[PDB]
UniProtKB/Swiss-Prot annotation:
Pathway: Xenobiotic degradation; toluene degradation
GO biological process, one term: toluene catabolic process
Annotated InterPro entries: MOase_MmoB_DmpM, mOase_MmoB_DmpM_sf
Annotated organism of origin: Ectopseudomonas mendocina (Pseudomonas mendocina)
Family: Belongs to the TmoD/XamoD family.
Subunit description: The alkene monooxygenase multicomponent enzyme system is composed of an electron transfer component and a monooxygenase component interacting with the effector protein TmoD. The electron transfer component is composed of a ferredoxin reductase (TmoF) and a ferredoxin (TmoC), and the monooxygenase component is formed by a heterohexamer (dimer of heterotrimers) of two alpha subunits (TmoA), two beta subunits (TmoE) and two gamma subunits (TmoB).
Keyword Amino-acid biosynthesis attached: no
Chain's role: Effector component of the toluene-4-monooxygenase multicomponent enzyme system which catalyzes the O2- and NADH-dependent hydroxylation of toluene to form p-cresol. Required for optimal efficiency and specificity of the holoenzyme.
Gene: tmoD
Descriptive protein name: Toluene-4-monooxygenase system, effector component
Recorded phenotype for the gene knockout or disruption: Cells lacking this gene show a complete loss of toluene-4-monooxygenase activity.
Amino acid sequence: STLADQALHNNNVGPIIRAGDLVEPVIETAEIDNPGKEITVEDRRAYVRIAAEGELILTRKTLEEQLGRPFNMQELEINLASFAGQIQADEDQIRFYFDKT
């Protein structure tokens, strides 16, 4: 996909989240676990795009404090309308990051 390849190579990386109870926790978490970095947020109602330059991390840990109920990363991942950049993901966090190739 041309559009998906553009998403791959975007300078600005991060999740696009379906509208719902996860948007606010994920914005908070983008700020807390990426301290001091410039973050961009765009609300289109159906979904919200959160991005930063180079890399963006969201830890399972931070998301749980922010939801204040039990949290598995699956629940972020299954609620990703899309995303920009590449992904490294595990049981504790997801990293969106820029593609150097």
